[PDB]
Design a binder for this molecule. Structure first.
Ligand code: ZN
Length: 363
């Protein structure tokens, strides 16, 4: 038994990829007939590789791939049980593993990170996190990037990257650090002193007054089904018609129906950052240039939505990232939180510090 990963090319159906990985047409039919009516298997996104576990005989035992809907990515994990295709449904299937990287830039940050196999999710989040302290494209030969992040493994196969837990960038001899601190939304990023990393202006407001965050950005395991789903933004539950505001100055690049996002507004900000405001009930008169705080629309349940909520999504260079401390203001910590933060960051700091003493990429 051994694994194979077949890269998804634009226009590929699940069948095309499985066929190209050498799987028999009969086997492909069985998979498409059984799950083709629960997820789009006819048009997969080419941002991944389909994983297939092939037994000694040469027949498939397990297939792993992501299906996409506007606002989410569902891990379709199938496995033969008694020779019958079933959805993997074990809370032991996925492991979330801490991963550490130390990269020394040769010509560019993004290229050196790409070479070290740092996933695009992580490269673009890193760029967003330090935006207020320095630009990532400004790193030169000799500069260094150290990362501690969650890596998601399904039956031993790395399928996705989770949150950055800690990051250190040494630029022109200056050390910049960011630590993830959490205590129903995710955490926030603070520097080594528990202070906000973001610039004075930029993203100074949440896009609305809301009841509660019904779903943060990130990978979540379904409590009963044990299936995995990436939420590509934050769902803020709020009453129908609640005003929605541009989180920062920018230019509106889209206003209208956007598939499963329903009524949506897209804003282009600086630094390749875009914000998306989805499921709106209505638009405002905002057009072209917008100011942070300007009303751009109103909460609804248009598109793929059960109840009223704003789906808020941040994209850096086209990649959806966790909006916290990137396209949202970071709340300042109280002296109490600063203490709890200092204690919680000691483990991550020890790891970054140990790799600092190494003058080349660790590999
Ligand atoms: Zn959503």
């Amino acid at each position: 038994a051994y694994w194979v990963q077949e890269a998804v090319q634009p226009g590929d159906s699940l069948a095309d990829v499985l066929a190209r990985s050498g799987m028999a047409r009969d086997e492909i039919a069985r998979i498409t007939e059984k799950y083709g009516g629960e997820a789009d298997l006819r048009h997969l996104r080419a941002d991944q590789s389909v994983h297939v576990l092939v037994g000694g005989d040469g027949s498939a035992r397990e297939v792993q791939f992501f299906t996409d809907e506007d606002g989410e990515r569902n891990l379709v994990a199938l496995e033969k049980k008694g020779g019958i295709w079933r959805r993997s449904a074990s809370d032991a299937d996925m492991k979330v593993l801490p991963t550490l990287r130390s990269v020394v830039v040769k010509t560019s940050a993004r290229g050196s990170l790409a070479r070290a196999e740092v996933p695009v999710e992580i490269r673009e989040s890193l760029s967003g996190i330090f935006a207020g302290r320095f630009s990532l494209d400004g790193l030169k030969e000799g500069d260094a990037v150290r990362l501690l992040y969650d890596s998601l493994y399904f039956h031993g196969q790395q399928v996705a990257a989770g949150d950055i837990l800690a990051a250190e960038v040494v630029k022109g001899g200056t050390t910049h650090q960011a630590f993830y601190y959490r205590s129903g939304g995710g955490g926030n990023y603070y520097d080594e002193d528990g202070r906000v990393l973001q610039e004075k202006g930029g993203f100074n407001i949440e896009p609305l007054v809301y009841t509660r965050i019904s779903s943060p950005f990130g990978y979540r395991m379904h409590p009963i089904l044990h299936t995995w789903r990436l939420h590509t933004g934050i769902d803020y539950a709020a009453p129908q018609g609640t005003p929605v505001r541009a989180s920062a100055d920018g230019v509106i690049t889209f206003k209208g129906r956007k598939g499963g996002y329903g009524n949506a507004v897209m804003i282009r900000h600086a630094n390749g950052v875009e914000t998306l405001y989805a499921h709106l009930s209505a638009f405002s008169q905002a057009q072209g240039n917008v100011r942070g705080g300007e009303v751009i629309g109103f909460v609804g349940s248009t598109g793929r939505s059960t109840g009223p909520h704003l789906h808020y999504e941040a994209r850096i260079n086209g990649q959806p990232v966790n909006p916290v401390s990137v396209a949202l203001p970071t709340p300042e910590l109280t002296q109490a939180d600063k203490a709890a933060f200092a204690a919680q960051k000691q483990k991550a700091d020890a790891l970054l510090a140990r790799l600092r003493g190494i003058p080349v990429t660790v590999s």
